[PDB]
Amino acid sequence: ADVPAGVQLADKQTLVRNNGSEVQSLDPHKIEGVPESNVSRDLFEGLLISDVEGHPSPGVAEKWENKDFKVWTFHLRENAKWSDGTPVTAHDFVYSWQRLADPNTASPYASYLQYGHIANIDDIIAGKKPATDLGVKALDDHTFEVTLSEPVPYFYKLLVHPSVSPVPKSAVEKFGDKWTQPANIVTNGAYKLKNWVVNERIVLERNPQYWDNAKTVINQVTYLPISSEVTDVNRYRSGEIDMTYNNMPIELFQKLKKEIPNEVRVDPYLCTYYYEINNQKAPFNDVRVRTALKLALDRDIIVNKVKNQGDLPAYSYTPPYTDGAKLVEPEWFKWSQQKRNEEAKKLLAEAGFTADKPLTFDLLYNTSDLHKKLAIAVASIWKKNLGVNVNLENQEWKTFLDTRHQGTFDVARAGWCADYNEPTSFLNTMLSDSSNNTAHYKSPAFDKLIADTLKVADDTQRSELYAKAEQQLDKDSAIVPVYYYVNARLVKPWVGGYTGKDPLDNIYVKNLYIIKH
């Protein structure tokens, strides 16, 4: 933290945070969500980290440089160490990025290295070359060099993501899958793992060996996994939680914004809520059926009348306020809802679906009070505007994410938040061979547009291409956009350091501090 001279610190520096769900894992190469990332950032530190304002800043690397935006050189700091006293060196990064790229790790973020365009990554992912050929190298103990096959000006912004955090080669090799148990884990972030009770709590304690330990204030942070937004808010109102998870129930949002207006933080967030369509499963592999679902959803009712929290109606995947985005609002979004419904009905009828023999499908969502409530409202709007019948289905967080990767679903609720602020953080997930492509969308026209964005000379031609890629995704109706998220949660008066101006919400518990109360 950076405590403001003139602030009284409480005597007990402990903090309880709700994390929304039980994480998939603590291994940084096996995770893909917001819950997983929240805890990861406190435990593992990569090259760069985000400041308190969300901008990229020195993490294990104290400074860095590039030649032609193609060769990136990181100068690591000499005092960087692990939780057992050993040092953090450039050899740890060479080994971690190689394990991320290796197909035997099966990371859902193995394509993150394709998004930074590291030399030989495509052949390594396809098993044609081994992971030791990856374009990374330790020039010395404190010098980590990266070779890209194409110029990537924003390469350094990708490095705050947890998938490119280092892992400890001695523990992984000795304990394999059991390396993350609290008995065997070695970490390099401000915290280390004290306890992990499945479905109950994850407790973390200050890491004496962290290079910036002098400025850490909190000594113990507890991460809860409560997926019910009502239970979370009622464990906060009644004192037991300090920072809720950032999903607010529809039931009590209203009352708390004037019952306790100063505890309700509402800020901009680079995330989009959407209904993902499995594009390869019949009859959803027909563009007419996908288009009808997209047009018949009434975003004004969902957003301004059922949710009512300040989210904005969405017409794209990439949020329009992302850095570098200049998107065109599509024709269908400008029409009246009644015209969208008659156009949607015509499309379904031409695809063989009518009243009397209607489209029926399963809608998968992850357990939650908010997603259930929205899922019931969307189902009734679709029933009313198109005559479709949807069967609701709920799965716990980690099973839900695995079902979408396996493609054993029809339509799913989904949410995607940026990893770095630039439109490819969203668009690269729709590339035909991406490991994050859970829509199972495959378009050679889309892939080429994105491939061309690294070959153009400037940022203005790049932004035009990004706009045309969103128009390609929209024309194919790969997903059904619903709203651009607002970051909304409860933050107790004593918690200090949460500004809320970071649109990625990359929060570090080492930047926080408890005030006397």
Domain CATH code at residue 441? 3.10.105.10
Say which residues have a Cβ less than 8 Å from residue 7's Cβ, sequence separation at least 6. 496, 513, 515
Same domain, 492 and 512: yes
Look at the block and give the residue holding tokens 């929209």. 474
Q: What are the helix and strand counts (H, E) for the chain? A: 17, 18
Same domain, 451 and 413: yes
469-474-475 Cα angle (round to 5)? 100
Instruction: Check residue 505 and give left, alpha or beta (phi > 0: left; psi -120 to 50: alpha).
Output: left
DSSP single-letter state for residue 502: -
Same domain, 479 and 495: no
Same domain, 464 and 370: yes
* 196 three-state secondary structure: strand
Same domain, 277 and 230: no
**What is d(CA 52, CA 215) in angstroms, rounded to the nearest whole number?**
14
> β-strand 143-147 against 71-76: which pairing, if any?
antiparallel
CB 409 within 8 A of CB 392: no
Way it was determined: X-ray
Tokens representing residue 461 in the block: 């031609």
Say which residues have a Cβ less than 8 Å from residue 371's Cβ, sequence separation at least 6. 365, 394, 413
Same domain, 23 and 115: no
What CATH number does residue 496 fall under? 3.40.190.10
Q: Which residues of 24-54 are buried (b: 16+ CB within 10 A; e: fewer)?
A: bebbbbbbbbbbbbbbbbbbbbbbbbbebeb
- Of 132, 152, 168, the domain-final residue: 168
Instruction: Check residue 443 and give left, alpha or beta (phi > 0: left; psi -120 to 50: alpha).
Output: beta
Same domain, 513 and 373: no
125 vs 152, 192, 235, 339, 374, CA distance in Å?
A: 20, 32, 45, 46, 38
Tokens representing residue 465 in the block: 């291409």
Documented resolution in Å: 2.0
Same domain, 341 and 445: yes
Helix H segments across 387-423?
397-406
**What is d(CA 72, CA 59) in angstroms, rounded to the nearest whole number?**
15
* Domains identified in the chain, total number: 3
**What is d(CA 292, CA 28) in angstroms, rounded to the nearest whole number?**
39
- Of 132, 147, 168, the domain-final residue: 168
Same domain, 367 and 455: yes
Tokens representing residue 88 in the block: 């953090």
**What is d(CA 348, CA 385) in angstroms, rounded to the nearest whole number?**
11
Domain housing 265 = 1-44+169-270+487-517
Same domain, 189 and 241: yes
- Of 149, 168, 187, the domain-final residue: 168
Same domain, 322 and 397: yes
Same domain, 449 and 331: yes
479 vs 79, 315, 381, 414, CA distance in Å?
A: 47, 10, 17, 10
